[PDB]
Amino acid sequence: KFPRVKNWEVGSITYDTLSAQAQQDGPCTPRRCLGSLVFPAPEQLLSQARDFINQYYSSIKRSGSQAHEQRLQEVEAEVAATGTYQLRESELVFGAKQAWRNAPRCVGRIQWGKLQVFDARDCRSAQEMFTYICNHIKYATNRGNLRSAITVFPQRCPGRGDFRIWNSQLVRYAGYRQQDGSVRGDPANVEITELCIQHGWTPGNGRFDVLPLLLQAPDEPPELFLLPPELVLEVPLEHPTLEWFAALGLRWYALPAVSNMLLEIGGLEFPAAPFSGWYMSTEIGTRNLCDPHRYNILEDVAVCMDLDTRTTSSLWKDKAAVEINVAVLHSYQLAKVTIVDHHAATASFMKHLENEQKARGGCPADWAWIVPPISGSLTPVFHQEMVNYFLSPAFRYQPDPW
Amino acid sequence: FPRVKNWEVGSITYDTLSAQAQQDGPCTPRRCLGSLVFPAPEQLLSQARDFINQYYSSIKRSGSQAHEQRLQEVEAEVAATGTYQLRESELVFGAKQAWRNAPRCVGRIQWGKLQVFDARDCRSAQEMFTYICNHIKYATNRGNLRSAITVFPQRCPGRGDFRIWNSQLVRYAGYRQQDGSVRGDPANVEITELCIQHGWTPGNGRFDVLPLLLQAPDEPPELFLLPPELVLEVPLEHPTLEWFAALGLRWYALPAVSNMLLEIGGLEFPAAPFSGWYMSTEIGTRNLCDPHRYNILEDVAVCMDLDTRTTSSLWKDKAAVEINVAVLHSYQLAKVTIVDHHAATASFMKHLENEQKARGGCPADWAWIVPPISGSLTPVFHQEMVNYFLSPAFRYQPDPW
Ligand code: HEM
Ligand code: HEM
Ligand SMILES: Cc1cc(N)nc(COC[C@H]2C[C@H](OCc3cc(C)cc(N)n3)CN2)c1
Ligand SMILES: Cc1cc(N)nc(COC[C@H]2C[C@H](OCc3cc(C)cc(N)n3)CN2)c1
Numbered sequence: 001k002f003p004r005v006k007n008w009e010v011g012s013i014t015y016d017t018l019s020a021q022a023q024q025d026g027p028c029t030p031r032r033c034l035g036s037l038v039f040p041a042p043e044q045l046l047s048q049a050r051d052f053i054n055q056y057y058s059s060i061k062r063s064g065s066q067a068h069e070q071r072l073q074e075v076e077a078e079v080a081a082t083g084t085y086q087l088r089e090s091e092l093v094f095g096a097k098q099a100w101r102n103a104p105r106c107v108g109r110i111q112w113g114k115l116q117v118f119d120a121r122d123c124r125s126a127q128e129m130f131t132y133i134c135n136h137i138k139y140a141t142n143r144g145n146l147r148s149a150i151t152v153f154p155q156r157c158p159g160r161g162d163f164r165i166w167n168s169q170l171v172r173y174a175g176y177r178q179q180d181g182s183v184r185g186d187p188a189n190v191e192i193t194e195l196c197i198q199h200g201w202t203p204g205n206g207r208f209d210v211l212p213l214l215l216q217a218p219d220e221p222p223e224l225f226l227l228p229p230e231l232v233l234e235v236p237l238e239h240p241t242l243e244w245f246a247a248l249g250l251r252w253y254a255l256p257a258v259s260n261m262l263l264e265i266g267g268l269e270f271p272a273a274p275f276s277g278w279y280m281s282t283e284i285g286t287r288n289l290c291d292p293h294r295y296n297i298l299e300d301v302a303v304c305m306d307l308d309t310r311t312t313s314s315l316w317k318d319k320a321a322v323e324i325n326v327a328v329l330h331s332y333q334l335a336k337v338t339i340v341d342h343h344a345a346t347a348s349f350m351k352h353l354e355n356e357q358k359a360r361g362g363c364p365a366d367w368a369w370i371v372p373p374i375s376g377s378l379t380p381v382f383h384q385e386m387v388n389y390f391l392s393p394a395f396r397y398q399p400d401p402w
Numbered sequence: 403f404p405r406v407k408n409w410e411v412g413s414i415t416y417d418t419l420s421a422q423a424q425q426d427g428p429c430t431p432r433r434c435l436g437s438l439v440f441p442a443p444e445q446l447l448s449q450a451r452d453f454i455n456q457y458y459s460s461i462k463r464s465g466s467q468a469h470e471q472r473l474q475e476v477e478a479e480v481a482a483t484g485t486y487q488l489r490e491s492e493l494v495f496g497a498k499q500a501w502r503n504a505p506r507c508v509g510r511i512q513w514g515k516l517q518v519f520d521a522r523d524c525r526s527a528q529e530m531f532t533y534i535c536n537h538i539k540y541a542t543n544r545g546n547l548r549s550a551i552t553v554f555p556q557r558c559p560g561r562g563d564f565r566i567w568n569s570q571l572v573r574y575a576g577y578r579q580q581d582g583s584v585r586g587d588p589a590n591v592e593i594t595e596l597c598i599q600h601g602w603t604p605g606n607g608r609f610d611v612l613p614l615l616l617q618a619p620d621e622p623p624e625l626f627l628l629p630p631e632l633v634l635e636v637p638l639e640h641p642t643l644e645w646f647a648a649l650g651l652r653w654y655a656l657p658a659v660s661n662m663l664l665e666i667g668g669l670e671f672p673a674a675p676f677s678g679w680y681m682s683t684e685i686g687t688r689n690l691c692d693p694h695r696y697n698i699l700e701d702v703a704v705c706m707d708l709d710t711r712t713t714s715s716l717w718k719d720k721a722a723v724e725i726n727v728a729v730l731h732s733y734q735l736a737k738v739t740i741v742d743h744h745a746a747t748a749s750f751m752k753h754l755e756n757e758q759k760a761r762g763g764c765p766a767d768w769a770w771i772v773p774p775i776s777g778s779l780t781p782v783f784h785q786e787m788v789n790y791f792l793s794p795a796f797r798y799q800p801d802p803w
């Protein structure tokens with residue numbers, strides 16, 4: 001009845017029984033698989049709330065207690081009287097951690113139980129959002145000894161617009177579109193760059209200009225806030241044996257902080273809830289720096305390495321990409337900023353899968369996202385079959401607010 | 403119709419071909435199982451008609467006299483015999499379509515170029531061996547590899563199937579050691595032991611070519627030795643690392659899959675071995691570096707003087723790249739056809755474009771199409787794909803033992 005899941009390296013087999021509890025539908029059908037696609041009332045709120053409250057009381061081993069029953073009744077009553085309900089602080093903490101644990105595209109989930117949760121549900125203005133965000137960044141960065149964290153802004157509520165952070169991450173480099181169609185800086189950020197400019201930002205003209213934040217309080221247009229440079233820790237990139245590499249003037253920032261996803265807990269929705277961890281080196285060295293549609297540095301690095309770029313069979317692309325990844329790891333370690341390589345990260349994810357099989361009888365995982373973008377089959381996750389499904393609490397994509 | 407996006411270029415297509423998917427896959431709206439390796443006259447006539455209609459459409463003769471005549475011919479045969487026979491032209495079309503339809507094959511730009519050998523008259527395992535040797539000779543062509551398939555008689559009621567027991571025509575022996583380890587290729591321990599059970603005298607090397615176990619209908623399989631002159635191999639050397647050659651690594655020229663079933667118009671061919679040429683990552687990354695295959699990555703890293711005591715030195719990645727370099731260099735030096743993963747994936751992108759115009763889409767399995775090293779350095783990583791089953795097709799089937 002349950003999907004049989006094999007590891008091909010070791011030959012071990014498990015059944016994913018957790019998948020039977022999937023709470024929402026994905027995009028696949030028996031006729032065709034769409035797994036590779038990036039982006040494919042009171043009664044329902046009450047059912048989701050009860051399920052969540054049940055999750056919480058199981059988690060602390062107090063299922064069936066007087067406390068468990070009291071909370072179920074209180075939530076049902078609150079929904080009946082007000083159309084919604086409020087989480088207790090302990091439930092919010094549990095819910096944020098479960099959403100991380102449930103995230104099928106995250107390879108760093110061995111860390112799921114260690115998350116600092118900042119409660120910003122009393123926030124009242126964009127100015128105050130900025131205060132909460134600056135404190136999050138300071139805490140999470142911790143002078144380079146990075147700590148995972150999430151700040152939760154007020155939930156969606158009838159009669160009131162949402163809190164939103166327009167930027168996709170708290171730290172993003174500007175992308176300035178040029179006349180020929182080319183881009184100076186990060187091509188991923190052309191749209192948000194133009195929005196900042198539309199909203200009164202005086203642009204720079206470098207390749208690594210840190211963008212301001214556009215923060216939206218309910219029923220207000222977004223407001224522009226500049227991050228203090230002392231707050232945004234960055235790492236200049238150099239290579240331990242290719243001395244010219246430093247002359248490329250590349251850098252990246254310490255803190256990956258996703259700020260445009262929706263956090264869903266017990267039927268409640270938090271459209272502003274930025275979360276941060278630390279980088280896996282391939283995100284920077286392979287994707288951000290080597291994607292043709294990002295900084296696209298591969299050929300210039302290969303030429304400086306004096307590789308033969310005239311034919312593909314010399315594997316110049318592969319050689320240059322490996323050395324760029326070496327530079328990222330070396331540079332972050334030199335700067336004493338937490339980073340994890342893809343071998344260490346995937347090994348820890350295998351341990352997570354093992355832990356979760358025992359704890360819950362399975363683990364939702366998106367193979368295409370878990371396997372790293374270089375050296376895929378050299379990592380244990382390549383050889384591991386995975387089952388992808390949606391559990392709640394969850395982090396979800398949402399439409400851009402403009 | 404699914405909207406399909408390329409993230410490198412931002413281009414969008416719609417796969418209208420997927421709406422024609424015959425067979426169901428393993429996914430449901432509740433959970434995706436896309437990463438898993440292995441998830442009556444009336445029915446036969448329905449598949450036969452669909453196939454005949456497909457063929458006549460392909461040659462621009464739908465509704466012609468010839469089309470209606472063929473449909474009547476097939477109906478009469480099934481009514482009389484319970485089955486039917488393909489014309490040779492239909493067999494060729496069907497085999498090419500099965501390749502074209504294979505979602506896991508990155509080499510499909512070549513689909514229209516396939517030599518089809520008709521061995522449907524085959525009677526004995528001895529004759530099966532002769533056909534197989536002729537296939538190997540033609541396909542190998544002194545290193546200038548040519549894609550080919552040999553089709554043995556179709557499955558029929560009250561008669562056993564022809565089967566090739568070996569998973570490929572060329573396989574290296576895997577010998578179980580007393581401590582439980584393997585000498586040679588661990589992928590082939592089972593078939594090696596079966597060969598031994600059937601009277602093969604084993605060697606004790608790391609690259610011993612296995613004999614063939616060939617099964618004629620209702621007979622036990624018979625052992626056949628491939629003449630060594632028929633099996634082209636390439637010793638591996640590296641262009642700049644002079645010690646690499648001393649490792650004594652080698653691989654064979656011809657990837658020839660022999661355990662899959664070919665399905666065409668409801669007819670089933672349980673023995674229909676097919677061959678092309680290698681993409682270098684198959685040998686250099688998977689066959690030589692998989693921990694459950696030859697597992698030589700750390701040996702190479704030792705020889706390269708790499709720091710194997712921290713993962714962050716990326717010693718694994720560096721050793722793997724040089725092994726792939728050695729494969730490409732060695733095959734090119736030996737004048738044996740090979741394609742690197744960059745060239746192959748670029749040609750596949752061209753194939754997707756051709757198929758969008760021709761058929762309105764292309765079934766493709768992303769996890770298999772993206773190469774096992776340097777995935778995102780290839781264009782296919784950034785291409786969304788839709789996976790579904792079309793017929794004619796190559797299918798997995800149970801081992802005959
Ligand atoms: C602690 C170290 C962490 C590491 C090493 C890590 C690693 C990763 C990586 C490599 C990705 C793929 C990102 C991409 O390719 O764009 C990812 C995605 C993701 N991570 Fe983690 N992560 C960490 C912490 C966290 C935390 C603290 C959370 C939430 C509380 C989280 C939730 C997610 C989610 C929801 C995604 C999917 C994002 C998307 O779909 O665009 N991660 N993570
Ligand atoms: C001509 C050059 C060819 C190249 C470069 C090529 C490339 C590949 C590669 C890299 C794979 C993945 C195999 C693996 O990872 O084990 C594959 C699979 C496959 N190929 Fe092709 N191929 C070629 C020719 C052919 C031909 C002639 C046929 C059939 C007529 C074919 C049918 C298939 C099928 C059915 C699979 C899936 C096998 C499976 O599921 O195990 N290929 N091909
Ligand atoms: C928490 C965390 C830790 C860590 N090591 N890495 C991350 C990176 O997450 C970045 C997430 C955000 C984008 O998703 C949204 C998005 C938007 C667009 C326009 C394209 C796209 N592919 N994806 C891509 N990956 C997040
Ligand atoms: C025709 C052809 C051309 C080319 N370049 N490469 C090939 C390689 O096909 C080899 C086939 C044998 C395995 O069959 C699937 C399989 C079988 C088994 C027992 C395990 C596994 N993980 N995967 C994987 N691909 C075939």
Ligand SMILES: C[C@H](O)[C@H](O)[C@H]1CNc2nc(N)[nH]c(=O)c2N1
Nearest residue numbers: 036037038368369783784785786
């Ligand atoms: C089309 C394909 O799904 C897309 O390129 C995915 C592939 N896997 C990925 N995996 C991760 N971790 N991050 C990504 O952005 C992507 N992109």
Ligand SMILES: C[C@H](O)[C@H](O)[C@H]1CNc2nc(N)[nH]c(=O)c2N1
Nearest residue numbers: 382383384385437438439769770
């Ligand atoms: C579990 C996973 O599906 C399995 O390891 C797949 C991944 N992708 C692959 N891709 C190819 N081309 N060949 C393979 O054998 C595999 N193995």
Ligand SMILES: [Gd]
Nearest residue numbers: 240241242243
């Ligand atoms: Gd140097």
Ligand SMILES: [Gd]
Nearest residue numbers: 704705706707
């Ligand atoms: Gd030495």
Ligand SMILES: [Zn+2]
Nearest residue numbers: 028033429434
């Ligand atoms: Zn699927």
